[PDB]
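Long-time lurker. I teach an intro course on protein structure, and each term I like to show students one example going from raw sequence to a predicted 3D structure in token notation. This year I'd like something fresh instead of my usual example. Would anyone be willing to generate the tokens for the chain below so I can use it in lecture? Attribution to the forum is fine with me.
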Amino acid sequence: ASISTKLQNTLIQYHSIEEDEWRVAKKAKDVTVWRKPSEEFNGYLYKAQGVMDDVVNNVIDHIRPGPWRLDWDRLMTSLDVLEHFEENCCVMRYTTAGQLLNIISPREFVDFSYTVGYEEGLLSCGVSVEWSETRPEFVRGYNHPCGWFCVPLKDSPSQSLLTGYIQTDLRGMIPQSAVDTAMASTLANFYSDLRKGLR
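-- Reply from a regular --
Happy to contribute to a lecture. Here you go:
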């Protein structure tokens, strides 16, 4: 629906929030993760950013569903396309393994997915949607607006800047100290893994 236009505008909006409001959450090799109180739920909106040694198309094609999508990502354990509208409008379901010696159990997510051009690059966003089929093995997490911005690097055409905004509500019951750690590490590892998947 027109939900995609709104999802798109929300993320461009987040991408306009300037540093002043972001609080460092973790500093990795070549990835920085920040967070700020979410205006969507009682949790945080995360910002992650780092350079990728590859072009936009290749980076985004590895982030969306396909051949080796579960292959490089240590946290995703399954991925299903449930409803496909336009080539760039999906409704997917994916599960996530347990984290922190099981302090966080396997999650399930059913998100709307939308990929569109952004500047000279691309925007691949999403938000969770209502889905009845439930499974006891997985607690359903809920993703508020989130997305990945990927655009060519300044004056380096062979590279690109990958910026992500993640606003996940893992639901269930987890102490905030574990949630904080988990989310910060999930984003940092996503870049490590993604860089390996690109090979």
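Some talking points for your students: The chain has one domain: 1-199. Helices lie at 3-14, 56-63, 69-72, 176-197.
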